Structures are given as C-alpha cells and as structure tokens.
Scaffold this active site. Structure first.
Site, short mmCIF file in Angstrom:
data_model
loop_
_atom_site.label_atom_id
_atom_site.label_comp_id
_atom_site.label_asym_id
_atom_site.label_seq_id
_atom_site.Cartn_x
_atom_site.Cartn_y
_atom_site.Cartn_z
N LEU A 19 5.51 5.26 -5.17
CA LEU A 19 6.49 4.25 -4.67
C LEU A 19 7.79 4.85 -5.18
CD1 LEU A 19 4.12 1.20 -4.81
CD2 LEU A 19 4.79 2.88 -3.08
N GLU A 27 5.38 -8.15 -6.37
CA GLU A 27 5.30 -7.59 -5.03
C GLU A 27 3.86 -7.07 -4.89
OE1 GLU A 27 5.45 -6.36 -1.24
OE2 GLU A 27 4.88 -4.81 -2.79
N1 LIG Z 1 3.60 -4.86 0.01
C1 LIG Z 1 3.10 -3.72 -0.26
N2 LIG Z 1 3.28 -3.25 -1.56
C2 LIG Z 1 2.73 -2.08 -2.02
O1 LIG Z 1 2.92 -1.77 -3.20
C3 LIG Z 1 1.97 -1.29 -1.03
C4 LIG Z 1 1.41 -0.10 -1.41
C5 LIG Z 1 0.72 0.53 -0.47
C6 LIG Z 1 0.07 1.86 -0.73
N3 LIG Z 1 -0.07 2.20 -2.16
C7 LIG Z 1 -0.67 1.42 -3.13
C8 LIG Z 1 -0.66 1.93 -4.45
C9 LIG Z 1 -1.25 1.23 -5.46
C10 LIG Z 1 -1.83 -0.02 -5.19
C11 LIG Z 1 -2.49 -0.88 -6.20
O2 LIG Z 1 -2.59 -0.51 -7.37
N4 LIG Z 1 -3.04 -2.02 -5.83
C12 LIG Z 1 -3.70 -2.96 -6.85
C13 LIG Z 1 -2.51 -3.52 -7.66
C14 LIG Z 1 -2.54 -5.12 -7.86
C15 LIG Z 1 -2.04 -5.33 -9.34
O3 LIG Z 1 -2.56 -4.39 -10.00
O4 LIG Z 1 -1.25 -6.20 -9.69
C16 LIG Z 1 -4.51 -4.04 -6.23
O5 LIG Z 1 -5.45 -4.50 -6.95
O6 LIG Z 1 -4.23 -4.49 -5.09
C17 LIG Z 1 -1.82 -0.48 -3.88
C18 LIG Z 1 -1.23 0.23 -2.83
C19 LIG Z 1 0.64 -0.06 0.81
N5 LIG Z 1 1.16 -1.21 1.18
C20 LIG Z 1 1.82 -1.81 0.22
N6 LIG Z 1 2.38 -3.00 0.62
#
Ligand SMILES: Nc1nc(=O)c2cc(CNc3ccc(C(=O)N[C@@H](CCC(=O)O)C(=O)O)cc3)cnc2[nH]1
Ligand SMILES: Nc1nc(=O)c2cc(CNc3ccc(C(=O)N[C@@H](CCC(=O)O)C(=O)O)cc3)cnc2[nH]1
Lengths: 182, 182
Positions: A19, A27
């Site tokens: 990011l 977010e």
């Molecule tokens: N709104 C939005 N925000 C983002 O950060 C995002 C990221 C991606 C692609 N990259 C990523 C990178 C890391 C994680 C991630 O760590 N997700 C975890 C974090 C939730 C938390 O840890 O608080 C998950 O469990 O969803 C997600 C997407 C795609 N759409 C998005 N869309």
C-alpha cells in the site's frame, strides 16, 4: 462479482508491492468486514487475487481468515502455501465456483487485486459492484487502478453497511463509495 | 489411482448402455463397499465416470451415495443433475484433486468407466491399481475393456478385503482380481 480496492487521489493502488500509504487500521477493518460478511447462513465468501497481492498480505494473516482464498497465476505450478485453490484465469476461477459442490458453499466472490485482475474483472460482461475507498491524498505509486467508466458504472449514494461521511486516520481522510453496473 | 470394473469372458463391459449380464446383487455390494470405503474419517472417496456411465446408473442411485460424483464431458454444457463436479478430461479432474481445499476432503479416487476413461487411466503414470471382477461367461457386448499390459500390471495373489474364492450368483461364476502398476 464484487471488486474491493482502496485508491489514492492519484489512482495508485501500489508501491513496491505494498500500500503506498501507511496502515489505516479502520480502513483495514472495513475491508475485513466486507469480504468476510456472508449474507447466507452457513455459506462463505471467496476472495480471488493475483500472485503479488497474496505475497503482499502480512504473512501472518495469509490466508485471509474465514474466507476461501483463491490465487490466479499462469506461472505457479501449485497453490502457494496456505492458498485454498489456484486458477490460471479469471474465467477458469469463475467456472470453478460454478461446480455445485462449490456453489453450495460460496456466497459472495470478491476480487482483491492486483491491477490487471481488476482490469479483467471490470470488463467482464455481467452484474458487477465496485467498493472503492477514496484516500484523499497523493501517494507515490507504481501500480494504478483503471478509470471507472461512467458510461457503465453508477455510484450508489447509499449502501447498507457503508457510512457516507468522510473518515480520517493519521491525518488521512478517505471515504467509501459503491459503484454498480449490469 | 483405482480403477474398478467387471468383465465378461469376452472383455465386454456394456450392452446398449447397460451391463451385459443380469444384476449380481453381491457384485454390486462389492463395488459399493470398495468405492464408498475411506481410510480417513471426515474424508470421502471420489468417483469419476464418463457421461454414458453417469446415465447408465439407475437415476435413483444417482449420484452414488457417500461419494463425490464427478463427470467427464467434453461437450456437456453444465453438470448433469445431481453430479458434484464436471471436468472435461481425466487431467483436470485429477488437477482438481490437488486443490488444497479439495485434497483434504478426498481420500481415494476411483475410475468407474467407461472404456475410454479406463484406458486413459490405465496408461497414466503413477501408482495405479485395477480391481477386476471376471464374470466367467460370454455375454454379447458393444463395449470392451482395454486389455491389460502384463508388461506393466502385476496380479496380486491376495489383497486385503478381497475374497479369494470363486463366487457364483444366479448360476453365474465370478472371481475378484486386483492388478497393480508402479
Ligand atoms: N478497502 C480496501 N483496503 C485494502 O487495504 C485493500 C487491500 C487490497 C489488497 N491487499 C491486501 C493486503 C493485506 C490485506 C490484509 O492483511 N487483510 C487482513 C487485514 C484485516 C486486519 O488485519 O485488520 C484481513 O484479515 O482482511 C488485505 C488486502 C485490496 N483491496 C483493498 N481494499
Ligand atoms: N465391480 C464392478 N461392478 C459393477 O457393477 C461396475 C459398474 C460400473 C459402472 N456401472 C454402474 C451401474 C450402476 C451402479 C449402481 O447402482 N451402484 C449403486 C448400488 C449397488 C447395489 O445396488 O448394491 C451404489 O451404491 O454403488 C454402479 C455402477 C463400473 N465398474 C463396476 N465394477
């Protein structure tokens, strides 16, 4: 088919495989809330993403939790660790979710990136919804999100779950928008 | 990899999309047990069969209970009513098999026919076993079982769960055999 992205004022979605902005925990929480929440009782959501976006999740929350994690790549010969499935195409991956053994277990399908996947998906004839987070500040990106064609997409001024007012985290304002097409 | 068939003396396996012989209740008991029995708890066996086979099963024995049913069809649009999965070649079905979420739900793979499938499966590299019931009589047939390469397959004199005695039912004699290849 739902697309979920967060973009800067400049439409950048990435930098160096991360990011381009510092971590917004709220977010993140919301992205985590949308792609998880399943509408149906006992059904699970499927996230799809390219090789790069999979490696870009903090190694310790891979695979996303409470979700079926699929990974598209024409290169990889097998699902990278923790991955639930692998497909070479967005079509092939859409087909698979059409197998009834599968279909009876999946509710919503969410496309999480990267760029070319969002591209392939935005075009795809069908009923598509775009969940976009407007991060109201520039950031230095190497990867961008496509132009949301206004011929095709319409912004839902309302959306069960999503707040309309401007948010702010670490001196960063942003707002959640929902676009739709058919 | 497990193939399971019954062959008349003239290597016939079908007459007008049906078995060439009258039904051997105790031979269908064997195919059933064998195909349904899993080494692991919470895991099930997978049955792959051609389209003609699918259809030769009495529509109320469809799909095979306690088993994940998979259909091989080059043309079929979508998966026949009640089948679990649809693939276009043994290859995808197998690949399908190595999908992590799939792989942890499935124990044994059994190829139930027809000719064209048995054959593709027979040649296929790996550790393959054929379970052959030799119906000790000639029956007019239109479908024949590929002939077993002795140069590659090897008769196992015994194999757990396989009665060793010549059997007879409705005056017909049959014998259970198991072939292995490395
Ligand atoms: N709104 C939005 N925000 C983002 O950060 C995002 C990221 C991606 C692609 N990259 C990523 C990178 C890391 C994680 C991630 O760590 N997700 C975890 C974090 C939730 C938390 O840890 O608080 C998950 O469990 O969803 C997600 C997407 C795609 N759409 C998005 N869309
Ligand atoms: N040993 C062997 N016997 C077979 O009868 C056989 C049949 C096929 C293909 N055709 C068929 C046709 C019907 C049913 C079937 O009705 N099976 C049921 C009920 C068996 C029973 O009635 O005891 C099942 O639950 O398996 C199975 C396979 C392939 N390999 C075989 N191999």
């Amino acid at each position: 088919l739902n697309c979920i992205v967060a973009v800067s004022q400049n439409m950048g979605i990435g930098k160096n495989g991360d990011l381009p902005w510092p971590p917004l925990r709220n977010e993140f929480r919301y992205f985590q809330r949308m792609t998880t929440t399943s509408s149906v009782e006992g059904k699970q959501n499927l996230v799809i993403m390219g090789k790069k976006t999979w490696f870009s999740i903090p190694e310790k929350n891979r695979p996303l939790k409470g979700r079926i994690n699929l990974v598209l790549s024409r290169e990889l010969k097998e699902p990278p660790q923790g991955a639930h499935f692998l497909s070479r195409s967005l079509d092939d991956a859409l087909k698979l979710t059409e197998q009834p053994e599968l279909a009876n277990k999946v509710d919503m399908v969410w496309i999480v990136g990267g760029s070319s996947v969002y591209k392939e998906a935005m075009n795809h004839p069908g009923h598509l919804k775009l969940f976009v987070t407007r991060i109201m500040q520039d950031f230095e990106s190497d990867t961008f999100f496509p132009e949301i064609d206004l011929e095709k997409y319409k912004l839902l001024p309302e959306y069960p779950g999503v707040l309309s007012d401007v948010q702010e985290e670490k001196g960063i304002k942003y707002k959640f928008e929902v676009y739709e097409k058919n």
